[PDB]
Structures are given as C-alpha cells and as structure tokens.
Amino acid sequence: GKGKPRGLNSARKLRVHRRNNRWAENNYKKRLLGTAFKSSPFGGSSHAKGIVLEKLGIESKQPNSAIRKCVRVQLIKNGKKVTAFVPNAGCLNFVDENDEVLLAGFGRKGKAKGDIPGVRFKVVKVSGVSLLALWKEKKEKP
Amino acid sequence: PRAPRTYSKTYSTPKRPYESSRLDAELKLAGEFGLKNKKEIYRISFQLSKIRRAARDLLTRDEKDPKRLFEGNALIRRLVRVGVLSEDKKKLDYVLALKVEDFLERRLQTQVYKLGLAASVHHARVLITQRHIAVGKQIVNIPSFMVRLDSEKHIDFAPTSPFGGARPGRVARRNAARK
Amino acid sequence: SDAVTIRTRKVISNPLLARKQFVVDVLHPNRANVSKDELREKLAEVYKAEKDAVSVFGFRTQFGGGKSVGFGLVYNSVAEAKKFEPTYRLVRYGLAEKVEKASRQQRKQKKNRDKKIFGTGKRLAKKVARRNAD
Amino acid sequence: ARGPKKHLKRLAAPHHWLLDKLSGCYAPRPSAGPHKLRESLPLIVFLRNRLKYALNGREVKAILMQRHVKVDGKVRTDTTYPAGFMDVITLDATNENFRLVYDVKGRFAVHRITDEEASYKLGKVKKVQLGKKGVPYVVTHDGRTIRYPDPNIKVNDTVKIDLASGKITDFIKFDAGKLVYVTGGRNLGRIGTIVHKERHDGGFDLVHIKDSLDNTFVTRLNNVFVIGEQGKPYISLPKGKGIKLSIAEERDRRRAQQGL
RNA sequence: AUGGUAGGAUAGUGGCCUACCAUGGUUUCAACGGGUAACGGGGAAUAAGGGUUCGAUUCCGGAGAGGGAGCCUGAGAAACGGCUACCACAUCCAAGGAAGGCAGCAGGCGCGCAAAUUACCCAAUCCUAAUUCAGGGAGGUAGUGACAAUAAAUAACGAU
RNA sequence: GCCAGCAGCCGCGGUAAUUCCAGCUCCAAUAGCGUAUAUUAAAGUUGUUGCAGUUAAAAAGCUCGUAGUUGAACUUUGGGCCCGGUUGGCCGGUCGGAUUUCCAACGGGGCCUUUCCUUCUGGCUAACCUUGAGUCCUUGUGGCUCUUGGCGAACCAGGACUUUUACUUUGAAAAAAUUAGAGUGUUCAAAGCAGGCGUAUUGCUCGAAUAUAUUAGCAUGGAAUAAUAGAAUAGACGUU
C-alpha cells in the first residue's frame, strides 16, 4: 500500500498531489514566474542587438592560467552590463570600440562555460558581417 | 487563403548518429546497388517501417474480422504488384520477413543492370538520367521508380533514344562534319 | 515528319450550345509536339465545320514529346461561337479584333478623378473665366 | 459578425457536393431555398462538376438566359437555385428529365428518367393547420403551400402533385410495413420497411427498417420518407435499387467487372 | 455587478441605457490581478520515433494613422493623402494673421550592431470610372545587393 | 626566454617551444570561409515514450483528511447451418491478361437453436414457404425465362416512445501558396504548370493530379473495453 491513494474516486486528490510535487522539478520552476520574461538578458529570446563599451581581460578558474578575451555591452533593449566572450585567434581586433555587435548564447542555458567564471555569452557578428569571415577572410569591415 | 496543400517528408533518420557497426552496412549497400546519398537507405528504411506496423496493427485484430482481411487482401496485393514478396509467402504474417534488401532489386536503377543493357550497375544509372531507357513507349528520368511486376518485360531504349533509332547522338554530328 | 494522327476522346452530344464536346489526342514521331492554326484543320476536315467555328486549348505534350492531348470543341456554325466564346480565345484565331482598352491603373484612376463632380460639371468650364478675369 | 453570411469558404461546402478542394478558393452558395441548404445543391454544380453539359461558371450563366431549364416545370435564371431531394430538372435542348435522389454509397445522383415521369413528385408531410379566413393546409418539404386537403392525410407521410398544377393526387400513410427511403445520417441513400415507429416524446422518435438483402436498422423519425407499399416503390430508384455493401462485396464487383 | 418587467436607443437583438424591482454571477478543474522584448494563424527552422523553439515579414483576419475625442457625407467611414476642436510636435509671415500629419513611394535626418536608387513605364497584372480611348510609385521593371539559394570556370592532352 | 603573445576546455611559454611572431612545408572547406549571439539536435542533463531520489543534489517528522487521481468480479456464451466475396494454389481456357471445376487462407451479410427489430396506419413490396407449364444435356439439389393465395424493416412519413456517455470506424465538410508527392528534359538543377505530335501549306491533341491537411463539431457502422440507468413503503407488461 505505497504512499498514494490508489481506489476509484481518488480522481481529485491526484491532479493535485502531481501539480504540487511538480514545483521543486527545476524546469516546470523557470516556466511559471516565466523568470526567461523578467530576469536574465534576452528575456524571452534568442539573439541580440548590442554596442560595445572597454575590451576587458579575464584570467582563467583553476586547474588552468589563461588571460581570455571578453567585451562589455548595451543591449538595444533593457540597456544591462553583461560581459561576453570572443572566438579563434586575435578576433579581438575586429571589435573596435562602440561598434555594433550581434550576441547569442553559450548552448548552456543560464549557465556558465568551461574555464571562465560570471560569464555567459558569445560574439557571433560585428557591424553584422559574421567574425567567422572577419577570421577566414571572406569579407572585411566598413 | 485556398486548401493548404498537404505533405509528408519520407525520411526517418537514425536514433544514434555515429558505428565501424552499421556504417561499413551502407557503404555494404550504396555501392554494390548503384545509389548516392544516405538519404536513400533512408527513404526505403521508412517505407518498410511504414508497412511493418499495418501488419503489427492487425495480426492483435480476431483473425477473420472484416478490416483485417478487407486490408490484407488489397495491403498484400499491392506488393505482389511491385516482385517485392513472392506468389507461393503471402499469408499476411510472413509480409514482417522483408528486409531492406529485397526492395532494392525492384528499383529500376539496378532492374536494368539485370535485361543486361548496361556494363555495370553506373552504366546502369547515367543510362536513366540521360533519357535513354522506357516502359510502354514511355521515358522514365529517375532511378527510384519501383518495378511494377507486370510491366519488367516491357523495359527498354526508345525511339526519341540514340541507342535504338532516332539519330546517332551529338558526338557522332561532329565525326561526320570532320572526315 | 512520318506523320500527325488525330486519335480522339470522350464525345458528348452538347445539345445546349449546338455544342459537340470531346478530349483530343496525338501520335507524333519527330515533330517536337503540335501547332493549333494548322490543328483545327484536322478536326474540321472530319467534323464538317470549316475551321473558324472551332476549338482546342491546353495542348499538353507528354514527358519524349512522342505523345499530345487538350480540349475538343465543335461548333454548329461559326455563328454560335461569335456567342458562347470567351473573346481572350478568338484572338488566338483572329476572329475578334482585340479591344485596345487602358493599363488597369488608369481605368480604376479615372473613376476617382468624375465621382466628385455632381453632373457634367460643364458649368465648371465657365466658372473658369468667373474666377480668372477679376 | 453582424447581418447574415453571404459567401461560402471552400471546405465548408458539404462533403457530398464531392467538390474538388483546390482551384476555387470560393465554392458557392444557395440563396433562400424552398430547400434544406445542406441536403441540397445548385445547378451551377449539377449542370459542370457532375454531368458535363458545362465546361466553366460563366458558361452556366449562359445556358440558363437562353430560360432553357425548368425546375418543377418552372424556369429559373437563378444561378444558385437551391434545389433538392425529389426534384425535377428538365432539359428543353435535349426531353433528356432527371429526378434528384441519392447515391447508395453516400452521394448526389446522376439519374435519368421516362419523359412521362417528370410529371409528378413526392410532396413530405410537414405540418397541418385550421389557417388564414378559417381554411386548413400542408407544407411539404419541397418548402412548398397546399390548400383544401383531405383530412385522412395526417402528420408524417408523402403527396404525388402534378407540377403543371399543385394538386394533391395520391397520399400514402405512416404504417408498420411500408417502403422507406432514408434522406439523411449514416444511412443516406438507402431503402425499405418500417418494421417498427418506436413512439416516446419531448422529442426523438426512432425508426426500424430492413432492405432487399435483409440487413438492419435504427435511425431518426425525422429522416424518413415513405414512397410506396413493398413492391411499386410511387419510383425510379437509381442503381445498386438503393442497398449498402460491406466493402468486402463492392471490392469484388470491380474485380466480376475487370473489363477495355 | 446578475436576472425580471416596460419603455427609450439601434438598421437591429441585449443592463446597450434608464425607470422601478429581486440578490444574484466568477473562483484551486486557477477566476480576478502582474508580466509579455504578444498582433493572430496559415506555416519556418529542427528533421527516428514522441519532440523543442520561432512565426514584426509575400496569402487570410484584426488594429492604426502624432495623441485623444466628436461628426459632415454617403449604401458603405468614427475615415486621417476627410474636417472641427483639444494637447503634444513643427512650418510660414509685412506679426494683422494664415497653413500643416512618410508607419503610400522615394529619398534624408535621427536611433543605433542592424538594412538599398529624390531613377524608367501602363507594355503585362489588375482596379476606377460617365466609361474600349484616360489615370493608376496598386503595380511592374531596371539601379544598389555576397540575405539566402540554384548551378559551375581557374587549365588540358602530347612528347621528351 | 612564465616576457610578448596564443588557448572555446585541457593547456603551451621560466635557452634546443610538435601551440606564441614569422619562413618553408603540408591539412580542411572551398567563391566562399570564419567570428560572435540567440536557438535547436546532441539532451534519456526535463523525461508521456525515457531519467534520478541507501550514501552522489533529492522520501516531507508522522498520521488524519476536502478536491485531485485511481478503483476485485458478475449480467449470450457456445454451437448450427447457409450463401457469396479476393488474396493463394491447380489448370491458362489462349492470338504477356480474360475464368471455370479442382482446392487452402481469410474476412463478412444472413438465418436457426427459449433470441427487440423505437413501433403502429398505409402505400412497397425485395424476397420465395411459392408453382401454374416444364425440361438444354455429364446414362441429376450441375442450369433460370413465368400469375394468382402468401416475407416486411430492401422505406417512405406521420405520430406514439425510442437509458445516457466517453472510445472507435468511416464519410463528408473543409483555401491555396508552403509540405510531402505524379507526370514533364527549365540546356541540368533550384524551378515552372508546362507540353506533345502532324499534312510543321492553314490541325490534331495529352494534361495542369493525388495524398496530408490532427486539435473542436456534425452524419455514421461498431458494441469489446470504462463509466452509468432502470423495480425492495412498490414496478413490468393488459386481454378485463
């Protein structure tokens, strides 16, 4: 006689005692307050527009040393101030201050990647022309 | 607005992606049967996986119930017409013991090969894309065709075609216009 | 060519418009499919209506060509066609010259240029010269 | 949305009109019929998507204009005349005479009749009143209005009229053993019995029938239409008598009939 | 707020609004509230099955015309390339007074990561007329264009 | 020479650096590569199909409870005769398909074995319990022309009365463009809705599909599953 009511008329007490439970399970937490719209940068999104400030330097977390390349942004929305991260080379160079940049996630949700600490985004485009190209030289910049 | 026109993909990919398991039985397929891309091994795979349940579905009606027989005897005769399964096997039952590999022989791609009119499997194909082969007096330009058993004997070469008629064929309006 | 041959299909004895309706077919070896003007003659030849009183739209031309199909229409007497005929058609055969209204853009803008004028407004022409010369 | 609708999105047209599904964004519809809308038709269908005698619809204005087709022995040059179960449609060119009446399967059908038989029709009786100056009258699913009629006639039968005239020649009754065409409901498109009404009484009355192959059944009183005594069924009936077949049989007759 | 009964109201129905009346209607099977970087869907990406996200955007609805209201015409508008005001904008001026609404095409400004020629036509496509004939930045078509997508050159054959 | 610098993460660099700067050399995509952002699959790390909860992060302190949710079994089974479909064999019956006997599978309508089919008034009959006559031919339960007593559910159409649900079948009613998909040589393809033959000297034509298109609602055959209802202060048929 495990812990649940079982007979026939035990609809009522079931549609409640899952709907309570669900709570805790983290996911169903995000989706009811859902956080996504109020908290976090993109709100209910995937991508966005921003414009750079400084070119900050963030060393490592440690089993590592690794002085990586990050940029503060200004979005073109809530305004948060965010940092974000660059790929490939130096990549830095090609992000010349107060330029237009196109930001996206980091495929991890929330969370925070690899050897970087409070950091949660990547730089996809600039000006809107790739980075991918303004490192495999299929275009160049204005 | 208008009747929004209706369409299902045929493909159903795999559940695990990579495997030196199943992989090195596609490349034993392609290959041996012509084909091209993996977007063939998986078309079929779907359409067998399609039929397969309409059996499962039945079997679980009783036997004898109207629906079960009708499809079976309508289901079956659809596969007798395409050569797929024999005469002698059709109880129902049994269509289940049909692996990928039976269907492939009844693709025009290869039925040409066997009707040799083709060096290897290849010379079996350009041979289809290039308007060359023909069923009635009618061209077909697509490897995946599926051989309807009672045609088969009517498989050509057409009037149009260069290998049975209307003219020599381009490269010949050249060896006769430089001596 | 090795000759056309016009084997025809679905003959209906339309009685409401003198017509005579059917679905045309065509075995052509080396033609590269087949010209209308020419085609009619082929039906008229047989069906006794001197071309003109005839139709034959949406040939379409098997996939190699080889074979064609459409649509069969024999009028009785050209008189009746002149009536139940869709003009767009006779301009295929040169039986009706072609009206050379404007583009539509004008034909619309020209409803919204006499709708404001209550009448002719031919007392706006002499309300011209009681507004100029004063 | 405010007054009543004047269009008809094609899809929304009834699925036995059988209408294509493509090309014509819109089907029709019928205006203010003597018929019911759904279990009816227009000539703009019956004269291209069924018979052929049109190609376009412009073409179907042009056959009508010409006053060259009479419904119930009367012209109409509506374009969407709301015709129905029981009708006459006479072809003036052509003595060519169609009684509307369903397939067996499910349909409408294309049934020819006997230039003689266009003659009359099978008036349903839908109500009965001493009405106006103190005069009795029956008002006929045909949505048509019939006066000085006998009192033997009661609530739920037909009555042969004469098209030329709105007379009321012969009437039939509703009794445990008469033939029945089923108008609407899975069984539209079938005959033919009244085994046993099953009274009740808000409302819902129910009926039992059988047929020529002994199959049987139970549908609504509403959807019943007497035609004669077992035999003489006051018509004609289209093929397959109107019969129903466990597709186990149908498939056969198209296999019997393989001939080309 | 929820119904009764009657009238006014409308093109009508109805607490639509008012006369008097009754105390009702919704609510853990999520109401009312707060959020939405929400116009809805058809559908788009993804594609084994079951799925997860995005659909401001080529068709179907609705909503605005810088905010707000009110109404003249007409069947047909709460119209914004129609008018009165009001307020938030901003133009002419002899300072008396006038006149004004690109989120139609264009174009410039501003904003910003972020997106193009003050170009040629009614010839097609279709609509407006009183009407075959005007007129139609609806439409088309050129210009700019790496958004994507299709095809596919940049070397073959000798002889040494 | 732990300084420049690289490195999505593990990490190189503190005097011979397979990582930095650069030469040659090779590898990968290739008129297109990279880069950042968002989303997807990867994600059986949101999970109904498919998770984990002895200690990894998680069984409430334990019990009662109004909702919610589930809920033992039991209410025609069996057998009897029919007659027919259309897969599969055995003849191909023949100038590669038409069908009969031989004959397996398999559905399915009858009807009967104590057998509701809401059921009355006609018209309706559609079928044979009929049989007024009989016989083409294998020395006959192999083959269907005809009116007379008598089949009602093959059905019209008025009524009296016909528990109700979910579930399932079909079928309709359903906008194209999209998606799948038949045709079809835009030179190929992406496309497109076109084309094909002649006497290309004056006329013939094939088409321009199907299918998906679910969630609500209708009409419909199912009657297993799962609910529910009739009659225990007495009802049910009724010839009186």
Author numbering:
A (entry chain BX): 2 to 143
B (entry chain BJ): 2 to 180
C (entry chain BY): 2 to 135
D (entry chain BE): 2 to 261
Article sentences:
The cricket paralysis virus internal ribosome entry site (CrPV-IRES) is a folded structure in a viral mRNA that allows initiation of translation in the absence of any host initiation factors. By using recent advances in single-particle electron cryomicroscopy, we have solved the structure of CrPV-IRES bound to the ribosome of the yeast Kluyveromyces lactis in both the canonical and rotated states at overall resolutions of 3.7 and 3.8 Å, respectively. Translocation of the IRES by elongation factor 2 (eEF2) is required to bring the first codon of the mRNA into the A site and to allow the start of translation.
The CrPV-IRES sequence consists of ∼190 nucleotides that fold into three internal pseudoknots (termed PKI, II, and III). The CrPV-IRES spans all three tRNA binding sites of the ribosome. PKI is inserted in the decoding center of the 40S ribosomal A site. It is somewhat tilted toward the P site relative to A site tRNA, thus more closely resembling a tRNA in the A/P hybrid state characteristic of a translocation intermediate. The interaction of PKI in the decoding center of the 40S subunit is very similar to that reported for normal decoding of tRNA in the A site (Ogle et al., 2001) and involves an interaction of the conserved 18S rRNA bases A1756 and A1755 (1493/92 in E. coli numbering) and G577 (530 in E. coli) with the minor groove of the elements that mimic the codon and anticodon in PKI. This shows that PKI mimics a decoding event in the A site. Because the A site is already occupied by PKI and the first codon of the mRNA is not in the A site but just downstream of it, the ribosome cannot start translation on the first codon by binding a ternary complex of the cognate aminoacyl tRNA and eEF1A in the A site.
